[PDB]
């Protein structure tokens, strides 16, 4: 019987963790309001025991991704942002998601703040109050289940458009802003899907403010970057990324804003590997930039005798 | 401000809290007196009429009030103010037993030709102990009292209540036999000292109750003097049941007390560290200054709660942020290394910032 | 050691209080006290107020020590209602004390 | 079936495949695994990334009961730097091994 | 009865004898180990091969409860590199006390 008691009960662990928290709060003089919020949140972790993912921490990341693709996957499929997006993008979002539960009344994000976390609303009701210039907050949308907030702010690189408050115990799937941006960059095609989804969302009911004007920015920028990335990797010397960039898209004959193909920069910087790879791509060897310069001229001007010979042959 | 109703009162209202404590005291008394009302009386005397009527009135108004008290929904975590939802919850949860216990069972017993089976329904009022259980569970979530200590005070209340109930049931079992077979009952064959409990139905209620509760308490600690013991077979069966159940109850009591003193305390754990350290301090004959340095190490290790850094590793990122940018942020804002940096970069620095303390 | 000292002290005090509650009753009706009705062996504690001090103390402390370990021989028992009440209180308190001893 | 080391991540743990077969694949951005090597018993991986301080070129995932012998990045480097000499003439030989791979450039 | 270092093995740790009796033994090819000396308190071993950089000169075998202070080879080498004059004084002490062992290198 004593062993059974000493093994511990859920409320006993609640008591210990809460008392530790109260020690830390009082000693750091957090403040009545903040003490109330943190106590409420961890009390939530102890009433619903949603922080049962601690066992998950032991289970390795591959199996964790599998459990993620069994639990978080349906909601993220339903998410309006990830409509028509590639399965790989969906999976990467699911793997990087973290479960959270927020008690009613809690202000998750505040209008004007930097959105460091993009939340997927899964099981709950929230609010989208806009803190106007006067300060009155009108509920833009109820942001019901299977939705997302923090998303337009992260992608459009604008501050938080509206304050989000909790109506009912909400099961949010949090995603770090930086992880979202990295996944967005790594899959540029799925990013294109996100941006057209954002634009078609404007044609739909997304109750957004001001103007987004980013799909067209993405149409220009994704392609212009990918070409630039090719040229910049050539100039820096990143042959390894250059192969992947050429295979991903654009064209090894693509030129920059000044009309410089990657061969020009590879010749100037004396990179025989990149120069050879462009040779197998059949890149123009007499292509001339806005300043009337051929890659042979750049190889000679920099005295890259090996690259000079490669271009001469 | 969602209390548009002038009838539903918030469950944390001060006046309703005072009523809750009042009905807790009445629940304690009524649940302690129901075994006494059942065992030691075959029908209440005229002296206790007003007490009985007033008690059931006090619990009936509690039944009435429970339809006007908001309850925090366990799926939406907001105080449901809807009167029909509140009434539905109370009617389906514990309304029937409160209502049945609120019947004047003594007057019904006397009215129904003095039938013992009617009096056997007095044990429905035992379900008023739900109030006491609720009070204890409310204490255990309140962090001003140690949980295990509350879990043992609850077990002490359970033990007090089981002894009182067992004493009443034991004397009732004595009364079940006709007064002609008094010599075959546990109390009717009692000759403690020179006093003989021959006609035990005529002795004053407190003498009988003190004797029966003496039996219950001494058997609760298994002292078993033997001066008082079972005689009938109904008494053997009841004593066997009570003794077998009390074995497990006392074992659980010992287990809970051992839980308190085995879990230990921060003082105890640090003291164990000190015992080991200061012992090493002595075996090697360390200089008192070096000893002071080591003692200062451990002293700051727990005193600045240096161990206490990762409790909030489970609080969500929003609150984790607010804590960090309300505690570590000012220093970083004034650090010349990050002078001129974006506030968001400083926020990221502060989020993963660790705390450490160093002695001179 | 604190619990052992507390338990020993409580036994001694309980024995003294037990004997005192035996003395509260008038000497005429001593047959209703725990010591006045004692017939241990062939020796009867008849004039319990005239016995040697150490016999009285050893009998009272025997009862206290026995009930402290809850042996409950039964030869000495709370005959009075006041004796019963005191034995009830002691026994209930010592159960918690012994549980604390086992836990420590 | 569990990934040991992930491509695009600087390896901080050199593993010695000693029992059980491991499989090394560079999964493409479209989700297509490309098994580049099959590291059986008495093989090593991660060493390129640590010696280079580059990211892992191929994600390595387990295929049988792979009894491996992990060696930390700081541990290895130390055996060469912190354990000077232990990591000078000998590591030069290790560099000869890596250049004799003939793919490392 | 235990052996600390065996004559011929590469020294990885320099040991100092605080208390207890150790025995340095030259194991010849005759099936026997000539007892070079009985290393006592305040002596040291694993230093001849850590300074003269040679193979362990004698098998050090335990005979009592020896409370040995151990110094890692790398650590000692690093400290010698930092403190060159102290290494001088040490090497001086080696040559002045070359009468300690006849088979000393």
Numbering used by the authors:
A (entry chain C): 306 to 618
B (entry chain B): 50 to 409
C (entry chain D): 202 to 305
D (entry chain A), E (entry chain D): 410 to 514
Manuscript text:
In contrast, the following cytosolic regions, i.e., C-linker (positions 314 to 364), CNBD (positions 365 to 490), CNBD–Ankyrin bridge (positions 491 to 542), and ANK (positions 543 to 722) show five distinct structures in almost twofold symmetry (C2 symmetry). Furthermore, overlaying GORKWT1 and GORKWT5, which had high resolutions of 3.17 and 3.16 Å, respectively, revealed that one of the C-linkers in each dimer was pushed upward by the CNBD in GORKWT1, as compared to GORKWT5. Additionally, GORKWT1 displayed a C4-like C2 symmetry in the CNBD, whereas GORKWT5 showed a pronounced C2 symmetry. Furthermore, we found a structural difference in the short structure that lies between the CNBD and ANK domains, termed as CNBD–Ankyrin bridge containing residues 511 to 519. This region had an α-helical structure in GORKWT1, while in GORKWT5, it was entirely present in a nonhelical loop conformation.
The GUARD CELL OUTWARD-RECTIFYING K+ (GORK) channel is expressed in Arabidopsis guard cells and encodes a K+out channel. Voltage-dependent K+ channels, including GORK, contain three regions: an intracellular N-terminal region, a transmembrane region, and an intracellular C-terminal region (27–30).
